[PDB]
Amino acid sequence: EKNYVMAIDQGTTSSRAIIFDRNGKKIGSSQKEFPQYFPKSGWVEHNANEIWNSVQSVIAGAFIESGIRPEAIAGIGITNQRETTVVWDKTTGQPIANAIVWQSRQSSPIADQLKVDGHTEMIHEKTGLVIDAYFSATKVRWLLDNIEGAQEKADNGELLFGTIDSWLVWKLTDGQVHVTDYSNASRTMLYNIHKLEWDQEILDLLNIPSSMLPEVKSNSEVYGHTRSYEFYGSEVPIAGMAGDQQAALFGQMAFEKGMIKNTYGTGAFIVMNTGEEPQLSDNDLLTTIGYGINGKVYYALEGSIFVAGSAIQWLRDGLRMIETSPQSEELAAKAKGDNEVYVVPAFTGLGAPYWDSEARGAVFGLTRGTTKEDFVRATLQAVAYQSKDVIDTMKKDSGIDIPLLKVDGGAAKNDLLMQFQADILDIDVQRAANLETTALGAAYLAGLAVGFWKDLDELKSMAEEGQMFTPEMPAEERDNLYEGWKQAVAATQTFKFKAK
Amino acid sequence: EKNYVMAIDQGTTSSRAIIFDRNGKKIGSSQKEFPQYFPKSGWVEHNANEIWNSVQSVIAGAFIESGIRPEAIAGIGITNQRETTVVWDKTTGQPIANAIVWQSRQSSPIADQLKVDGHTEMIHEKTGLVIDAYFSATKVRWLLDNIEGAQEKADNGELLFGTIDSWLVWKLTDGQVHVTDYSNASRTMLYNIHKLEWDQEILDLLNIPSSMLPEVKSNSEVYGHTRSYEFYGSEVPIAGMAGDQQAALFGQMAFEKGMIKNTYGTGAFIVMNTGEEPQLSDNDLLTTIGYGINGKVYYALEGSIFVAGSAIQWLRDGLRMIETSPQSEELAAKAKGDNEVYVVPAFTGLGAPYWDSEARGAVFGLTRGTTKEDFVRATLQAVAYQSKDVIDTMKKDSGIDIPLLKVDGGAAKNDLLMQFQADILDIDVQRAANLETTALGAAYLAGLAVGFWKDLDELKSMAEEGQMFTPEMPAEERDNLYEGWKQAVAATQTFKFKAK
Structure with a gap:
């Protein structure tokens, strides 16, 4: 030892x-x-x-x-x-x-x-x-x-x-x-x-x-x-x-009330630390436990996006539209269309803030000109758009403004996707230097328990921030892109056909 | 225990x-x-x-x-x-x-x-x-x-x-x-x-x-x-x-003099046990030590074919003619040609019985009707042909008639190839129940050293017989196919171009 x-x-x-x-x-x-x-x-x-x-x-x-x-x-x-x-x-x-x-x-x-x-x-x-x-x-x-x-x-x-x-x-x-x-x-x-x-x-x-x-x-x-x-x-x-x-x-290191992250993996999950009290307003989100340490219990608000990375797996394995999952960013970067196609990949229903278990996956805005590249680009963008739904809900619920989103996960390696996320949110997105912050977090917990690191301050002193993405898309372009997403989701939610 | x-x-x-x-x-x-x-x-x-x-x-x-x-x-x-x-x-x-x-x-x-x-x-x-x-x-x-x-x-x-x-x-x-x-x-x-x-x-x-x-x-x-x-x-x-x-x-368990195996892997290697005195004639073959145990040393004759499995890797990575190695079995089985195409994949020179370091890979009998399937079949058949070369040399050198060849190695799983081998040799080919007889050999050696198994008789009591392939091709076809191989090899050995 x-x-x-x-x-x-x-x-x-x-x-x-x-x-x-x-x-x-x-x-x-x-x-x-x-x-x-x-x-x-x-x-x-x-x-x-x-x-x-x-x-x-x-x-x-x-x-x-x-x-x-x-x-x-x-x-x-x-x-x-x-x-x-x-x-x-x-x-x-x-x-x-x-x-x-x-x-x-x-x-x-x-x-x-x-x-x-x-x-x-x-x-x-x-x-x-x-x-x-x-x-x-x-x-x-x-x-x-x-x-x-x-x-x-x-x-x-x-x-x-x-x-x-x-x-x-x-x-x-x-x-x-x-x-x-x-x-x-x-x-x-x-x-x-x-x-x-x-x-x-x-x-x-x-x-x-x-x-x-x-x-x-x-x-x-x-x-x-x-x-x-x-x-x-x-x-x-x-x-x-x-x-x-x-x-x-x-x-x-989201130890303080209000601090917020998003992890992009198989799904994407936005979690806000709310401190020692749950949160006055839970609307359209989950109230959960963040962690219990030092005698205290710290609560969190969570918005879950079930299908994120797995939408890309589907493109690979279901439609066979792509050969490998990394090939998806190559194709998306080459998209030439107006950016008017929307994929809402709710294979198992819509997660937060919708929590609509009857919704299924849908696509909108298709034209004759829509290419493979366009479709793959729209699929990747879904997770950025729903992340905004969730984060807007978090502001509404928490009454806190959100100037900064920390981000991690395998899928966060895609620079263009992270720039898009910042662009549509119009807030800074801070990517972790080490994308596997899940494992780091578990190591911190264990290290504190055994005295390997003694205090939350020794953890902070290890912090070495990563890539910052700043918003650079004008309000009119951003408002339009997001308004089309909201209409796509709205239309997705109207398809509720159940046989017999 | x-x-x-x-x-x-x-x-x-x-x-x-x-x-x-x-x-x-x-x-x-x-x-x-x-x-x-x-x-x-x-x-x-x-x-x-x-x-x-x-x-x-x-x-x-x-x-x-x-x-x-x-x-x-x-x-x-x-x-x-x-x-x-x-x-x-x-x-x-x-x-x-x-x-x-x-x-x-x-x-x-x-x-x-x-x-x-x-x-x-x-x-x-x-x-x-x-x-x-x-x-x-x-x-x-x-x-x-x-x-x-x-x-x-x-x-x-x-x-x-x-x-x-x-x-x-x-x-x-x-x-x-x-x-x-x-x-x-x-x-x-x-x-x-x-x-x-x-x-x-x-x-x-x-x-x-x-x-x-x-x-x-x-x-x-x-x-x-x-x-x-x-x-x-x-x-x-x-x-x-x-x-x-x-x-x-x-x-x-080729423990007696005269017993012979071939292992089909990256290369193919025919080895005959020649007992406690080396073999009288080594002509065109290697004399090597089979194994030393019980204070004695058992010698062996070997004919080495450098390129067997690696010819199929070359089809995959070099020519990009097949998608994966397993797929070669499947393409070769569909070949419709007269079986008159010969591939001599001597990329690094010809092994036993030729030992010609200056020969390179070559192909013969191409016509407009030669398909990928025919090309792949000819590539696989080379190892069977060159194994006949080697086995005939071993018969020549040892005076032992060789009525049985034991076989193993990953590539021996191919039933059509194992049948072809038996066909052109006109001797029975017995495949090991467990294709990895290499690892089994090492286990037997270790177990004998520590008394896990005491005596060679405890080893023989484990023998479980494998699939037998018996020759079923008439002399005329067998002799024509092999004659063609020999002309292919002769022609390969005549190409000895060196710049300057």
Whole structure:
């Protein structure tokens, strides 16, 4: 236990591990994709054993690339795709079925039914969330409805539930620790964010035995130590944990009320720190927990954009319009049209501020002159436009003006996209020097827990700001582009055809 | 109470690790490609640190996939691309330069000069080999010629030489052990195979200091134990070692005199076991050491075909005629032509039985109706034809009639190619149940050294038979196809153009 901390980032389509020194500098890293299953249209599943294997792989890869040995690791921090739900057998460690991903709509019939039975308001008051298949609760209900015998095993204390943080810590401790942090728990829709406890009324409503549930802890404390007889001959403290979007918020050093970031990945998620009190007005956004450290709980407002990077995957894999995902920026830069085509890629419904689960993907403004380049450019721009919807909502809700947006994520590497984002927002966009701020955030949490870094000030002193994009598009051009987006979304929301 | 053996197969374009149980069943494996460098025409280099990283990765991957723990491995067998040469600093452990691959012709001017100065008869009588850039000797000379200061450091005991086996054992032991086995040693062109020692007269001729050279040991004994603080730990015996083609011979259980195999991979290599006395006539073939075990040394005859699999990589990367390598099987199966097109892919010269370093790749029988499919089929068929050349030479030299050929290697999976091989040879072709008999060979060697398996009879009790291919083409067709090949080769050997 010495001079390095490791972060593991278990993302939607790949896992990553990174080892940092006491300066916050990257010494080694490794990344590996894992299988995505789509058994029925709208369903998305992961095999949790394959997720664990990808994590084992990248932990190995980080050590191999760094030349660092486990005995030198002070702490491990863990961050993850949120909501994605695993249920597993307590004795064998075997998942009962595939994990259901946050992307999946397979549990929508159950969410719909909860709405028809009138629970929307109660759920929102307790959890800060909205009744939707997005969150863990209906994924658990789905698994206990559909996996033969699962409900009875659960009623007999034999099955455990966990989000990915919890699953991984379980794996790493070989079953000794079944824990989750406040930020991940807050995403389950089973957790009361005001009383800070699993909500018994929701549990009863859904017939989920409380014996399935992990204990909830802060985002920065020692949860246990590795056994994992792959982590070599070392018992390393598992010491920081947060949902990926909250990890990014922390890694961006957004510690003060009002500070705001956006992470561009498979989806895009705008999170504002609101401090120790939720927020007077939640309208059209989620109220969630940012992080719990130093005895205190810090809340956040979040607007979720479900489909961002995955729209580009669709172009590649569905339409086969592009050969690779990076090729998309090459094509978009070459677009020659008037910029009047709009793609609203709401494959699973519109996220914030709309939260309209019946919307599907749509395209507008097509003409004979519309080229592949134009269509790909419009697809990329969607995430910038919806980010503005969200950020305007955040100003309205928070009554705070927003002079600056910090940004991170794989997709934020696209300079032209970031310039466009600044241009349409008419606010400065500050891109992180190290785009993987999710992993950095988890490393910070773990480092603070073990005394690797002592104080939030030692973290600040590591801050080395990145590329700044300043707005350079005139008000008339910007107002026109955004007004066309609003009309596109409006028109998308009018298509609500349901068969029979 | 340890119940598994691991084999590491460090090949020409990828490395692979497999864990076997005491019945020989594969429990887990992992394979990883690593960069191939071609700095000039005819040169082929590997970064030895990247090769080490690939082996680290696959050692992890096999543990990860199998669920087995390093404390349960009875011993590790290592097998490798032969001749490939690394020279490194004894103190830093840093290679002085890229390794020079067996494929590389960069040291040809040095080999050429040795032939001009009449050293053929003497090198062959000492080593069983021929003077060619293929073998390690001229590659070490190239490194001492061309890396500034290298000859002086070598002369001062500061640099070590190793084929890949030796490099890997050095890395695994963190610099404790500098060893090589008889089979790998015999391929350097620095090792006297009659006297079983490094040949001083060859070393003086090439000005190679003997302090560079590893100790030479048998193919089955404990060379040392792992440190490798990534091999978790667990100090596991490093216990079997052989050049890849000799490991395959052992893996096929070709333990008796006369028994013969061919391994179809990047190159193809026909090896016949000639027992405890070398073979009487070596004409047109190599005399090499098969393996040393039980205090005895088993010799072998070899015919090497440099370009087999790599002809298909050339179709993919050079001509861009196919999308991936697997696709070649599929194109060849659709070929409609008379089968009268011949491709002699001798990019770096012709191997056994020709050993003509000045021949280059060539193509014959083209007509306006020759399709891509026909071109691809002719390319694949070359290795089958040249294997007949070699097998007929072996029959000539040994007087042994050869009624059966055992086969293995990745490229042997192609049933149409394996049938064609049996067809043109008019002898039965028996494919290994497990195509990676190389790794199996290394495992057998390691297991025998630590008593995991006690005696050769325990090895034979594991034999599970593979697919048999029996000849089914009449004499006239077989004789015409082969005659055409021989004319193609003759014509290739007549093109000997050299500028100036």
